[PDB]
Amino acid sequence: DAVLAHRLAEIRKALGHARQADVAALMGVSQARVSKLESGDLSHTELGTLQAYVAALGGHLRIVAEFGENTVELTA
Amino acid sequence: VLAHRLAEIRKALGHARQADVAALMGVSQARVSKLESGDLSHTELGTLQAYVAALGGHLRIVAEFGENTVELTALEHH
């Protein structure tokens, strides 16, 4: 049962153990950069940035588009 | 069910051409062209949302963490 995230930081908080500093260091950016990212709109977040953020958290992105009762997976 | 390219998706799921999608999104055909050709690393989530929506579909993004899963909402611009 998936938890819902309306904000980038809610993805991290769902895991519990990964602090903001942890994700920054794993992404290889300053914590100031991650604080900036987490204060923004999810809709204006770049896909590459989202990918790196989720990867730093130990996960991977599934990008799906539902068409009718079918679903296509985007591999980009 | 798998697609390396946005264009692949468009062409299999109907008959919309690039100018059709551009009009639906209210963006340049250039932008749509770069979407389907270029690398999506610097593409905003809301832009991808709008593209899939113009094709008549619904974008879902899921962060998969093994036994746990986080689904993103509010992917739409406004």
Contact at CB, B2 and A72, closer than 8 angstroms: yes
Residues of A in contact with B60 (CB under 8 A): 63-66, 71
Which residue type occupies A67?
F
In order of B21, B26, B42, the CA distances from B70 in angstroms are 30, 31, 22
Residue A61 touches chain B, beta carbons under 8 Å: yes
State the CB neighbour count (10 A cutoff) for residue A39.
10
Q: From CA A66, how far away is CA B78, in angstroms rounded?
A: 21
Task: Compute the half-sphere exposure of residue B1: CA atoms within 13 Å on the CB side of its CA.
Answer: 4
Q: From CA A67, how far away is CA B3, in angstroms rounded?
A: 13
Q: From CA B62, how far away is CA B65, in angstroms rounded?
A: 9
Backbone angles phi, psi at A38, to 5 degrees: -75, -15
Task: For domain A8-73, give the fold.
Answer: 434 Repressor (Amino-terminal Domain) (1.10.260)
Of B15, B23, B45, whose CA–CA distance to A7 is shortest? B45
As given in the structure block, the two tokens for residue A13 are 């908080």
As given in the structure block, the two tokens for residue A67 are 């068409």
Q: At what resolution in Å was this solved? A: 2.0
B2 φψ region: left (φ > 0), alpha (ψ -120 to 50), beta (else): beta
As given in the structure block, the two tokens for residue B49 are 């949302």
Q: Which helix (H) or strand (E) segment is B71 a member of?
A: strand B68-72
The domains of chain B are located at: 6-72
> Are the C-beta atoms of residues B59 and B53 closer than 8 Å to each other?
yes
Contact at CB, B13 and A72, closer than 8 angstroms: yes
Q: Is the domain defined by B6-72 classed in CATH 2.60.40?
A: no
Orientation of helix A8-15 relative to helix A47-56, angle to 10°: 10
Return the sign of the alpha-carbon dihedral for residues A38, B76, B70, B39: negative
Residues of A in contact with B4 (CB under 8 A): 75-76
In the block, residue with structure tokens 């340049």: B28
Q: Report, in this order, helix, strand and coil percent for chain B, each rounded to 5.
A: 45, 20, 30
As given in the structure block, the two tokens for residue B71 are 């689904």
In the block, residue with structure tokens 């979407």: B35
Task: Using only the alpha carbons of chain A, give its radius of gyration.
Answer: 13
DSSP-assigned states of every residue in A2-71: PEEESSHHHHHHHHSS--HHHHHHHHTS-HHHHHHHHTS-GGGSBHHHHHHHHHHTT-EEEEEEEETTEE
Q: From CA A19, how far away is CA A29, in angstroms rounded?
A: 14
Residue B17 touches chain A, beta carbons under 8 Å: no
Which technique?
Answer: X-ray
> Are the C-beta atoms of residues A43 and B49 closer than 8 Å to each other?
yes
Contact at CB, A47 and B48, closer than 8 angstroms: yes
